[PDB]
Amino acid sequence: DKIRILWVDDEIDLLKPHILFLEKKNYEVTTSNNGLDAIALFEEENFDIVFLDENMPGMSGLETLSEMKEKKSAIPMIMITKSEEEYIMEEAIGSKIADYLIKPVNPNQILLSLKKNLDDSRLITEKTTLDYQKEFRKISMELAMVNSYEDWVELYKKLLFWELKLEDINDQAMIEILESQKVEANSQFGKYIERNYEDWFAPKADKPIQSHNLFKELVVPEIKKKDKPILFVVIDNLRYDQWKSFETVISNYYKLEKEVPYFSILPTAVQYARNAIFSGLMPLDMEKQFPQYWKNDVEDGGKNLYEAEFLSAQIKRLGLNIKEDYFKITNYAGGKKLAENFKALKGNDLVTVVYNFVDMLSHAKTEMEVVKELASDDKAYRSLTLSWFKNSPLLEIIQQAQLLGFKLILTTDHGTINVKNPSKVVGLNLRYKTGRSLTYEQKDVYVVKEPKTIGLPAINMSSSFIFAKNDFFLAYVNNYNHYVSYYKNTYQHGGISLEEMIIPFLVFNPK
Amino acid sequence: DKIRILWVDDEIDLLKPHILFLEKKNYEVTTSNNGLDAIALFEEENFDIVFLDENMPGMSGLETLSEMKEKKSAIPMIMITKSEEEYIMEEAIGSKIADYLIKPVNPNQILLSLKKNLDDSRLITEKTTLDYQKEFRKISMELAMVNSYEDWVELYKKLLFWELKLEDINDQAMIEILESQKVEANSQFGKYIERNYEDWFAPDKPIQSHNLFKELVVPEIKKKDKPILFVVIDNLRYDQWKSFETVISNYYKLEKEVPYFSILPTAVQYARNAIFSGLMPLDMEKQFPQYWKNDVEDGGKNLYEAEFLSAQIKRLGLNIKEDYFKITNYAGGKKLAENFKALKGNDLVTVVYNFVDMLSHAKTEMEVVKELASDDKAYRSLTLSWFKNSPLLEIIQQAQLLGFKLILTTDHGTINVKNPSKVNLRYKTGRSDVYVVKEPKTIGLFIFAKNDFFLAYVNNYNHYVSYYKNTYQHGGISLEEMIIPFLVFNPK
Ligand SMILES: [Ca+2]
Ligand SMILES: [Ca+2]
Ligand SMILES: [Ca+2]
Ligand SMILES: [Ca+2]
């Protein structure tokens, strides 16, 4: 099959050089001098692409385009004209032109547009497949060399890059290679954390930015600037990948000023991590200073019901007299309400919004076959997340903030991992446990006998902490088989994994 | 805000004309003579677009691109160079370049590329809105003119066209006009059906559920040229199809598309069974009491489709090797993907995929699905996500390799019910806004909700309204439900 081109121009007899060029390139060009002939050609015959002049005696190119797009919206249409008017350019771009070439045109420029608009998807597939084949060995090498949290952040960035690049690939072999590297990554990372996590709490020992540090170190800078109002959003349970899946969407509204990967504290759970962000204190300290607000695992009810109170305290503790408000979105109506009334929040210097949909979506796979099919693999989960955010009430809140000229700070508390392998436990989050009579496979988990060392509560001195590594889910020995069937291939958090601990901090200035 | 350009070229002084031109158009341009310095500027500051020469002393533009894209993948990158080599063009397009301008370049070509890659969304919003503003009155007029089923089929195509076009627009006025026309459409359509559905069963009627297999499918098999994959997606609206038609194109070329009218009530029990049997519910009950089930009966109503289908093949006097599969879950669909290989020698493969129906009513209950499918746009977006990553696509991807012709259809669609009707929420079977059929015999079988109505029992009216308001329901008369797609595709 040769590519069939329909070229419409009043002076088409003058462009025969170009036609002869495309001819040798095995491109078949049918010509027309009027739009009406072209529509007739377009309706009768099945073309792959269409070239149109704008200034044509009779129907204009744009008029002809509109008619044709009504009939066959899939066919790419390129404009080749002498018109240099900015306004004509804009009308055609808005008419969803595939390219606009100003005459006189280099024949190879038309070839560029033909390749770009007809073979791009294949070229990307080909390039991606080849470029990875020349990188995966190097990826393996780098992973075995990793020795720092900064090196872990860089390698995660690389892994994420290739993950989303290989979702436009067909070669399963390369995908299995990448999955293998991601597995080895978590394996090595968990050992790294198992070896370094405690020492990070030694005074002055070089530690990354963590949950309890986030506000004072990263947000408080932005507020001191006193240049703009700030919307500080916390999307619960957002994996780095998921952010990357909707980064282009956010771009349509917000320019990224700053991105800092930061490490969630253990356990990587809402109860501990999020409260830490809002308090600027570690869970243990929150237990000490705010027993009225803190809630241990044993305690019933919500565990993050007093985030606003912790936060207001931190702002007061940091001696900032500012206007601040706090919203915790837990459902559609709540988010839609806040979106339609965000206007009222103009006066505030700071607006903090907590959003919980993705955590809810993540856990839904455990309970819904619908979400099972919609989030079969990470790619699917990314695609599902993108569908959400593109139609999310949160985006309406973000769009509203942009209109009000608010600076946007997007962050999370932790991520989630698709657990695949069961680990037996006797004595929750299925990735972390605390208690006295704890039985565990120690090769499978990171044990902290003295929790107060890692800034965690300890009901008793006996009490300790266990954190599942890699893709392990802690399964109680009672009803082991049932635990395994129900939680296998489900998103669980609270443990140590790249997906869970390394999460994004993002600052955006309004466009 | 001025747009910041990062332009890298070895001969960046030879490009002073261009830079001056851009600058006058309020474009801020930062220049560099080498990729390495450019990479540094790319990281240190936040630019909006980057221009790159290929042939450069030092790192090539493509090398500089790769390094930059790893550091900030969002930023659009344009290549401006003399290289005419097909391979360099190909590498840039494989490298996800936004545009590639061959030197010497017209300064306006650069400007077009700047606008095209940075302001297109806004321009398209403006153009789309204005195009509709000047077309909606014509659309209303055609709607006031429609008086045939072919007329209805065409206006539906028009409405669907504008639906997908205006989904991203901001002008609420125009959005509400489209909704008005959509409402009026089903209103007038329901009257059309109410006034012609009965007569259609008297010896000009459209293709319907009881006629689909013999009138459309049977011919395509008589050709005896290729093996056939006959997929029935339960509860698939035309808009949903349109949302993933791009994806299907990457694998299957559309040979034929025929809108047909689902039989009333638009429910799998009655409609999908007819598709496989070629009989109306009344006749289905008479000929196969062994296989038919009424509303009063217990259990699944479409376990006998394979038997009905085999029967229809026999009743049509054809003998071919046939199989029937009903996918109802992820495992089931992912299973059939690998084993689809084996069944190639068998002539026809029928796959029933019921995931879409499941998704529709999930919104009725789960807050997750409520956010994922709050509006039609979101529902279409959700369908596109699904299909792109579905075992069904793998089934289709298998068939093309096996050189199967694909026939894709549904049994009915679903509509966002919003208004309650005091008394499945779109059809009922005993006497208690609506299409009344005193004799089920005449229509080969009742009440029929029209116009986004949900039938609510009077005993628990309030609760039915609160729970089933703004939920996808099927079984009644609406364009969204009755006018459904029949597609035949030859493998690519
Ligand atoms: Ca002309
Ligand atoms: Ca959770
Ligand atoms: Ca050069
Ligand atoms: Ca249903």
Author numbering:
A (entry chain B): 2 to 428, 434 to 517
B (entry chain A): 2 to 204, 207 to 426, 435 to 443, 450 to 462, 471 to 517
What does the study report here?
Here, we report on the structural determination of PorX, a noncanonical RR that comprises a classic REC domain and an additional enzymatic effector domain that exhibits phosphodiesterase activity. Our crystal structures reveal that the PorXFJ adopts a two-domain dimeric fold with a classical RR receiver domain's fold and a unique alkaline phosphatase superfamily (APS) domain connected by a helical linker region. Each PorXFJ monomer adopts a two-lobed fold containing an N-terminal receiver (REC) domain (residues 1–120), followed by a three-helix bundle (THB) domain (residues 121–209) and a C-terminal APS domain (residues 210–517). All PorXFJ dimers adopt an intertwined assembly, where each monomer is symmetrically wrapped around the other monomer, forming an overall “X”-like shape.
Additional support to the link between metal coordination and residues 358–369 conformation is provided by the T271V APS catalytically inactive mutant structure. In the T271V structure, a density corresponding to a divalent cation could only be observed in Zn1 site (coordinated by Asp360, His364, and His499) and not in the Zn2 site (coordinated by Thr271, Asp237, Asp414, and His415), while residues 358–369 of both monomers adopted a helical conformation instead of the helical-extended coil dyad observed in the same primitive orthorhombic crystal form of the wild type. Moreover, ICP-MS measurements revealed that the T271V mutant had a reduced ability to bind zinc with only 1.22 ions per monomer, instead of two seen by the wild type. Using the REC domain's phosphorylation-null mutant (D54A), the APS domain's catalytically inactive mutant (T271V) and their double mutant (D54A/T271V), we confirmed that these residues can specifically undergo phosphorylation in PorXFJ. Mutating the catalytic residues T271V, the metal-coordinating residues D360A/H364A, and the APS dimerization interface residues S384A/S388E, abolished the observed phosphodiesterase activity against bis-pNPP. For example, the catalytically inactive T271V variant exhibited a mixed population of both monomers and dimers, while the zinc coordination D360A/H364A double mutant remained mostly monomeric upon incubation with zinc. However, our attempts to co-crystalize the catalytically inactive T271V variant of PorXFJ with pGpG did not reveal the corresponding density in the APS catalytic site.
